[PDB]
Scaffold this motif. Structure first.
Motif, PDB file in Angstrom:
ATOM      1  N   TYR A 113     -14.696  -2.420   5.343  1.00  3.97           N
ATOM      2  CA  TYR A 113     -14.636  -1.937   3.989  1.00  3.97           C
ATOM      3  C   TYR A 113     -13.154  -1.965   3.575  1.00  3.97           C
ATOM      4  O   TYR A 113     -12.855  -2.115   2.398  1.00  3.97           O
ATOM      5  CB  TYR A 113     -15.251  -0.552   3.869  1.00  3.97           C
ATOM      6  CG  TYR A 113     -14.325   0.591   4.142  1.00  3.97           C
ATOM      7  CD1 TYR A 113     -13.510   1.080   3.142  1.00  3.97           C
ATOM      8  CD2 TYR A 113     -14.305   1.231   5.382  1.00  3.97           C
ATOM      9  CE1 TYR A 113     -12.690   2.186   3.347  1.00  3.97           C
ATOM     10  CE2 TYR A 113     -13.484   2.348   5.603  1.00  3.97           C
ATOM     11  CZ  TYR A 113     -12.683   2.817   4.565  1.00  3.97           C
ATOM     12  OH  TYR A 113     -11.912   3.951   4.689  1.00  3.97           O
TER      13      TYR A 113
ATOM     14  N   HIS B  79      -1.466  -6.560  -4.865  1.00  2.00           N
ATOM     15  CA  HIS B  79      -1.450  -7.593  -3.838  1.00  2.00           C
ATOM     16  C   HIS B  79      -1.401  -8.990  -4.476  1.00  2.00           C
ATOM     17  O   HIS B  79      -1.386  -9.131  -5.704  1.00  2.00           O
ATOM     18  CB  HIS B  79      -2.775  -7.518  -3.096  1.00  2.00           C
ATOM     19  CG  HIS B  79      -3.935  -8.012  -3.916  1.00  2.00           C
ATOM     20  ND1 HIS B  79      -4.464  -7.296  -4.968  1.00  2.00           N
ATOM     21  CD2 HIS B  79      -4.587  -9.199  -3.911  1.00  2.00           C
ATOM     22  CE1 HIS B  79      -5.382  -8.021  -5.581  1.00  2.00           C
ATOM     23  NE2 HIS B  79      -5.475  -9.181  -4.958  1.00  2.00           N
TER      24      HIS B  79
ATOM     25  N   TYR C 180     -10.690  -4.334   4.712  1.00  3.27           N
ATOM     26  CA  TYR C 180     -10.262  -5.675   4.392  1.00  3.27           C
ATOM     27  C   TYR C 180     -10.984  -6.249   3.148  1.00  3.27           C
ATOM     28  O   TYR C 180     -10.387  -6.989   2.334  1.00  3.27           O
ATOM     29  CB  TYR C 180     -10.298  -6.592   5.611  1.00  3.27           C
ATOM     30  CG  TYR C 180     -11.624  -6.911   6.215  1.00  3.27           C
ATOM     31  CD1 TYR C 180     -12.552  -7.708   5.559  1.00  3.27           C
ATOM     32  CD2 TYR C 180     -11.921  -6.492   7.494  1.00  3.27           C
ATOM     33  CE1 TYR C 180     -13.764  -8.079   6.184  1.00  3.27           C
ATOM     34  CE2 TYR C 180     -13.115  -6.858   8.124  1.00  3.27           C
ATOM     35  CZ  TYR C 180     -14.033  -7.639   7.465  1.00  3.27           C
ATOM     36  OH  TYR C 180     -15.236  -7.918   8.086  1.00  3.27           O
ATOM     37  N   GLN C 181     -12.226  -5.820   2.942  1.00  6.32           N
ATOM     38  CA  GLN C 181     -12.986  -6.270   1.800  1.00  6.32           C
ATOM     39  C   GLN C 181     -12.342  -5.735   0.548  1.00  6.32           C
ATOM     40  O   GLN C 181     -12.203  -6.450  -0.439  1.00  6.32           O
ATOM     41  CB  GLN C 181     -14.423  -5.774   1.865  1.00  6.32           C
ATOM     42  CG  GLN C 181     -15.246  -6.385   2.974  1.00  6.32           C
ATOM     43  CD  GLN C 181     -16.709  -5.950   2.935  1.00  6.32           C
ATOM     44  OE1 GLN C 181     -17.210  -5.283   3.851  1.00  6.32           O
ATOM     45  NE2 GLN C 181     -17.408  -6.343   1.880  1.00  6.32           N
ATOM     46  N   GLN C 182     -11.912  -4.483   0.589  1.00  6.91           N
ATOM     47  CA  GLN C 182     -11.325  -3.858  -0.591  1.00  6.91           C
ATOM     48  C   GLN C 182      -9.817  -3.691  -0.664  1.00  6.91           C
ATOM     49  O   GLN C 182      -9.336  -2.990  -1.558  1.00  6.91           O
ATOM     50  CB  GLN C 182     -11.937  -2.485  -0.814  1.00  6.91           C
ATOM     51  CG  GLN C 182     -13.422  -2.445  -0.942  1.00  6.91           C
ATOM     52  CD  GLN C 182     -13.911  -1.047  -1.156  1.00  6.91           C
ATOM     53  OE1 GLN C 182     -13.432  -0.358  -2.030  1.00  6.91           O
ATOM     54  NE2 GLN C 182     -14.872  -0.618  -0.369  1.00  6.91           N
TER      55      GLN C 182
ATOM     56  N   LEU D 244      -8.027 -13.119   5.848  1.00  2.30           N
ATOM     57  CA  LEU D 244      -9.359 -13.114   5.246  1.00  2.30           C
ATOM     58  C   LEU D 244     -10.139 -14.326   5.735  1.00  2.30           C
ATOM     59  O   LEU D 244     -11.326 -14.236   6.048  1.00  2.30           O
ATOM     60  CB  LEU D 244      -9.283 -13.159   3.733  1.00  2.30           C
ATOM     61  CG  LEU D 244      -8.840 -11.900   3.014  1.00  2.30           C
ATOM     62  CD1 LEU D 244      -8.559 -12.290   1.593  1.00  2.30           C
ATOM     63  CD2 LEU D 244      -9.889 -10.822   3.087  1.00  2.30           C
TER      64      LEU D 244
ATOM     65  N   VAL E 108       0.785  -1.215   0.000  1.00  4.43           N
ATOM     66  CA  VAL E 108       0.000   0.000   0.000  1.00  4.43           C
ATOM     67  C   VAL E 108       0.827   1.281   0.000  1.00  4.43           C
ATOM     68  O   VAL E 108       1.700   1.456   0.858  1.00  4.43           O
ATOM     69  CB  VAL E 108      -0.877  -0.001   1.257  1.00  4.43           C
ATOM     70  CG1 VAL E 108      -1.805   1.161   1.267  1.00  4.43           C
ATOM     71  CG2 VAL E 108      -1.624  -1.287   1.361  1.00  4.43           C
TER      72      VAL E 108
ATOM     73  N   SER F 208      -7.805  -5.545  -1.780  1.00  2.00           N
ATOM     74  CA  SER F 208      -7.417  -6.138  -3.054  1.00  2.00           C
ATOM     75  C   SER F 208      -7.332  -5.124  -4.179  1.00  2.00           C
ATOM     76  O   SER F 208      -6.985  -5.468  -5.324  1.00  2.00           O
ATOM     77  CB  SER F 208      -8.442  -7.179  -3.468  1.00  2.00           C
ATOM     78  OG  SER F 208      -9.234  -7.575  -2.379  1.00  2.00           O
ATOM     79  N   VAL F 209      -7.767  -3.908  -3.886  1.00  2.00           N
ATOM     80  CA  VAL F 209      -7.752  -2.826  -4.834  1.00  2.00           C
ATOM     81  C   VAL F 209      -6.318  -2.258  -4.985  1.00  2.00           C
ATOM     82  O   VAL F 209      -6.031  -1.473  -5.901  1.00  2.00           O
ATOM     83  CB  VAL F 209      -8.798  -1.783  -4.386  1.00  2.00           C
ATOM     84  CG1 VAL F 209      -8.188  -0.486  -3.988  1.00  2.00           C
ATOM     85  CG2 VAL F 209      -9.727  -1.548  -5.455  1.00  2.00           C
ATOM     86  N   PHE F 210      -5.427  -2.636  -4.068  1.00  2.00           N
ATOM     87  CA  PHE F 210      -4.039  -2.199  -4.099  1.00  2.00           C
ATOM     88  C   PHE F 210      -3.264  -3.364  -4.654  1.00  2.00           C
ATOM     89  O   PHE F 210      -3.752  -4.488  -4.611  1.00  2.00           O
ATOM     90  CB  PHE F 210      -3.531  -2.000  -2.690  1.00  2.00           C
ATOM     91  CG  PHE F 210      -4.038  -0.786  -2.037  1.00  2.00           C
ATOM     92  CD1 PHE F 210      -4.884  -0.877  -0.942  1.00  2.00           C
ATOM     93  CD2 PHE F 210      -3.662   0.468  -2.494  1.00  2.00           C
ATOM     94  CE1 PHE F 210      -5.344   0.252  -0.320  1.00  2.00           C
ATOM     95  CE2 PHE F 210      -4.120   1.607  -1.872  1.00  2.00           C
ATOM     96  CZ  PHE F 210      -4.961   1.491  -0.784  1.00  2.00           C
TER      97      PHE F 210
END
Lengths: 226, 21, 246, 200, 113, 200, 246, 21, 21
Positions: free
Chosen positions: D120, D130, D122-124, D169, D99, D126-128
């Motif tokens: 919100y 990874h 941990y859910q997202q 997760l 990140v 994955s947008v970085f």
């Protein structure tokens, strides 16, 4: 020589989104080169090239145990306002717009141990009186059989099926452009393990991406929280 | 993105905005 | 496995025919979304006299339940230009003000800021004093009258004046050598400058600041926070809307 | 598999330093190996080990540490490999992301710690950039990150652009023992500026 | 002309606190000026910063406020042909904008201080 | 004028190390400036300031010091300029030489000191690479020395091949004040080996 | 000596790599800096009646703690054109004025200046008289009303009218054959002309004169005076600013 | 320096400013 | 003499002034 001009009635008004700029008062500023990686130009691209985890009962996954069968393990109605789509990027990006079009891609990742195995049946059920309660009922619909132990991850596309070219982002009491049906996942077989005392349950993470044909239009302002 | 008048360039590109190097 | 449809074999999925385009993703375009006036901030006018403080134009760390607030928090680094609309809305009787000039001064990122009334206007005995930094000069001064004004506003464009090639919306470090809880997600000059609204009205009303961000560039997407609460398991949120069943 | 975060690293010198820049060769900025911690059954989804790079472990980066320590600014990328030591009877999954400008850390700034991410996030996450570390399929994550920051270089004492987030997760189930999380960090294309005084 | 001395001039980057002796500063960028080789000596204070521009108007130390220190030490004390006649010598110090120097953003004058 | 001691420096890596060698660039092994001491009227011919390189001043060699400190072996030459600050009314002369394996030092090993050379030594010190520093003609001596030693590299903690000897041949006369002796030292073609542990 | 770096030899300096351009020195451009409105002067209106004196437009020998003042004192000779903005700000009750015409007259360098009310307007008994030199004619007369005016101003451009090819900002000599302490740093006509503001308001308010200097040319740079005091030895001045540690 | 409108020459160059010889 | 706008001919030469024969 003075030009005859007629002032329109909407004359001295504001109009917030006029397609034109204001007068500049601080000219000639050359800005430093901004190298920096990872620039993005359209939110739909990051929505399509990225996945988020769903919110199934507050966790990013559903569970299979050595006691399962019939009943659906995961069920969500196809609407961006659905609960299990809550913490996701696609759902959250959507609140900026009024309408959407296209498919959603869901991929399930089985994180149960290597000594564990189970089979799932995932179905897309179209709008109907009331949602199937058992898998023998749902299996009449569009479905896929996921045998873990063949592939640990499985992608399923929820299609777009509607007489309207776009559907509503903000749902409400069921209308013809509100909801598109349900996505359900059943256990074709319960979790089997090498030792039930060591591994009794396995978790399937469920992630969502915008499909290739997904799109969002009509930017909207945020309403009162709820 | 969002400038659609023929008159958006009433002021030169260097006066109206910044310029990248 | 097997891939496409109707044999029902393990791993096999049925056929899907992707939809044709229509809208062309125009609305999800970053710079399109930001090039519009947003009502961010509302602010008080300073009296012509005294030693007022300048208001810094920093729309970055907002919590406001408004669309610009979250949106600006969707990237790690940001660059854009700026346009402003300043309006003035009475909070008393409009007849209190017979003239009501308002001096607006904009300052580029890094500008010195100490002001005290120093410019005297003289006329028939009585006199009027304005701030050292309200006078028209090096940086833009805008003067509009509120009295008969058909819009009690002003507006102009200004460029990106920061020294940073990009504004960090998030910063894992300190903006000063002394590491004070204060200078933490900080970095000096990560903004658009500052303005100074000054007027004999000051009581009598307030302003309304709208920002428009032409030429926006966003870098490194970040998670987008929810906006609404989570509905019950297996349900859907239901909102009032244009559509809705009558 | 190697994941490049945003782009590949470059060896271009900072546009904003008119003073001599020293390019640390690979044999100088070497590579360092750390144990991040132990993933237990009790810890729940959302829990994350936050590892800003480097700043709490700079003192353990031998050679690189000595050179960086003596100069004011540094531009450099990182090559990290996060691993996990679990058996084939362990279930669970992590998401290890890189990140830029990570913050939350309640000013325990630039210290490797543990926190509970807010949903919100941990859910997202994955947008970085990874990689998922599913215990039934793999044991490693490999991320390579370029220098990133608001300006062409920084002072690692005051800023850590990149921070590695190892997030739970799917909780650890299976054999009772814990799963140790491991990490190798190697500074890449490091460039150093302006030498500091002698430490008397 | 009957006088001589040697100077060590150093550019010290931002740091906890500025060196107090030359053996400390000599670890930094520095030049040795032997008068009696050249009577004049030019030294360039470089621009070193993560920001593309720094502030003209400084204040309590920030990351874009200050760029470090310029110091000049005596490598040797003044020597003379007769200490009673010449006991001290003065070094004039002049500044010029460097070749890469630039100024932007015109600003209005604030209250005097 | 530049005097090369025995030969010009080379950047060849040590024949006896099969482990990675790091070449310190000029911007890393920089240059350091010291005051050697003050030459007084009272001191007599034969008196010498002995400056083994470096070993008592390594701690003041900033950058170079940090790198050398973290490695086991080092091969490198030196570029030294010795100067003197005297008026044109001062008389006297020194002989500044670069001596390989200098010894006498009564085991005040590797410490810059002052001693009285024994005659046949001051008479013949000119047999080593050197330069005369006559106060009526010049004020500087410039010597450049290659790496030298019994083996292809050494450990500077235990061995200082080169030592600079500044010796008084003709006593200081003229104005009463002393003449300060000055010296700039710059490591040249430095190559470093085998990184040492972290200092915990 | 030796020149470039890392041997540490006497006279040797280390390597420096010059920075690349970015801003292009656009902002330090003489004519760019001067082509903007500056609030220089503030002035009183004359009554329609009587024998008023004209105000000479000479912004040259100023001491004002303002950016235009020092800047104009940075050269020895100056040439530029001129633009004016005249505003009018009440110092009493805006309802005192029901019409409020203001006659502005500009005079080129060298123009004759004696005026007395001489032009009568007649209407229903009562009459109004304006100055001999306020009437519209050979040189520009501007007439604006202050009453309902949305900006109580006027503005126009005027050229360099001096007889000197260049205006001496500094003059080591006398402008008249009689060498009086008065005519010392003098030289007649080293200015932009003069104006005459005349109105039935006169009490009730004052003006605000802004100058803009298009086509500026400066000759022979001169020292630039400090602006602030000298801080203590080895310290730095610390000013309030946009940036500053919160 | 500082005139960036396309309309800066609404009045001829000889009317708007002075002219050098 | 004294008409320097580009818009001085907003009205045709025969409408704006008189015409010589």
């Amino acid at each position: 020589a003075p030009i005859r001009v007629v002032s329109v009635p909407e004359s001295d008004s504001f109009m917030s989104s006029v397609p034109d700029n204001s007068t500049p008062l601080y000219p000639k500023v050359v800005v430093p080169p901004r190298q920096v990686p990872g620039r993005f130009t359209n939110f739909i691209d990051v929505a399509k090239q990225t996945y988020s985890f769903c919110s199934i009962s507050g966790k990013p996954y559903f569970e299979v145990t050595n006691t399962s069968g019939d009943e659906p393990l995961f069920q969500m109605d196809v609407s961006l306002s659905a609960a299990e789509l809550h913490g996701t990027y696609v759902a959250s990006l959507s609140s900026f717009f009024a309408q959407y079009r296209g498919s959603l891609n869901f991929n399930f990742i089985f994180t149960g141990a290597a000594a564990t195995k189970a089979k799932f049946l995932v179905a897309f059920v179209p709008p109907h009186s009331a949602a199937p309660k058992t898998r023998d009922e749902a299996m009449a619909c569009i479905h896929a059989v996921w045998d873990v132990g063949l592939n640990s991850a499985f992608s399923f596309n929820v299609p777009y099926s509607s007489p309207a070219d776009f559907m509503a982002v903000y749902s409400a009491e069921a209308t013809v452009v509100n909801v598109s049906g349900w996505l359900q996942v059943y256990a074709l077989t319960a979790l089997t393990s090498t030792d039930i005392a060591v591994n009794s349950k396995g978790r399937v993470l469920v992630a969502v991406s915008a499909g290739p044909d997904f799109s969002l239009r009509h930017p909207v302002d945020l309403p009162d929280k709820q | 993105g969002n400038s659609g008048s023929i008159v958006q360039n009433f002021y030169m590109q260097q006066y109206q905005n910044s310029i990248d190097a | 496995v097997t891939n496409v449809g109707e044999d029902g074999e393990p791993g096999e999925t049925e056929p899907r025919h992707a939809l044709s385009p229509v809208d062309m993703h125009v609305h999800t375009d970053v710079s399109f979304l930001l090039d519009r006036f947003f009502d961010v901030e509302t602010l008080e006018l300073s009296n012509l006299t005294g030693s007022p403080a300048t208001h810094v134009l920093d729309p970055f760390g907002s919590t406001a339940q408004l669309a610009w607030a979250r949106l600006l928090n969707t990237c790690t680094y940001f660059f854009s230009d700026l346009e402003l609309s300043i309006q003035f809305k009475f909070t008393t009787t409009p007849s209190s003000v017979g003239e009501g000039f308002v001096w607006v001064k904009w300052f580029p990122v890094g500008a010195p800021t100490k002001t005290t009334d120093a410019w005297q206007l003289e006329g028939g005995g009585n006199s009027v004093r304005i701030q050292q930094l309200a006078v028209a000069g090096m940086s833009p001064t805008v003067v509009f009258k509120i009295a008969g004004s058909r819009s009690q506003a002003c507006g102009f464009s200004v460029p990106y004046t920061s020294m940073w090639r990009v504004v960090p919306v998030f910063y894992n470090g300190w903006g000063a050598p002394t590491k004070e809880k204060a200078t933490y997600n900080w970095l000096p000059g990560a903004h658009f400058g500052s303005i100074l609204l000054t007027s004999d009205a000051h009581d009598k009303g307030g302003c309304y600041l709208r920002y428009r961000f032409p030429r926006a560039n966003m870098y490194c997407p970040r998670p987008i926070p929810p906006a609404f609460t989570r509905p019950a398991d297996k349900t859907r949120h239901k909102f009032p809307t244009n559509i809705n069943k009558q | 598999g190697t994941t490049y975060c945003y782009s590949k690293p470059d060896g271009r010198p900072p546009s904003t330093v008119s003073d001599p820049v020293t390019r640390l060769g690979p044999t100088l900025s070497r590579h360092y190996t750390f144990k991040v911690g132990e993933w237990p059954h009790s810890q729940s989804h959302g829990h994350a080990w936050i590892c800003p790079l480097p700043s709490d472990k700079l003192k353990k980066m031998g050679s690189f540490h000595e050179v960086v320590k003596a100069h004011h600014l540094v531009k450099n990328g990182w090559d990290v490999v996060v691993q996990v030591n679990a058996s084939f009877a362990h279930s669970g999954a992590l998401c290890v992301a890189a990140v830029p400008e990570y913050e939350h850390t309640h000013e325990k700034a630039l210290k490797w710690s543990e926190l509970e991410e807010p949903a919100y996030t941990y859910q997202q996450l994955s947008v970085f950039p990874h990689q998922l570390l599913n215990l039934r399929t793999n044991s490693s994550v490999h991320l390579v990150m370029p220098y990133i920051g608001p300006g062409p270089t920084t002072n690692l004492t005051l800023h850590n652009p990149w921070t590695i987030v190892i997030l739970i997760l799917s909780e650890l189930t299976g054999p009772g023992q814990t799963v140790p999380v491991t990490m190798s960090v190697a500074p890449i294309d490091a460039m150093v500026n302006g030498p500091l005084p002698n430490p008397e």
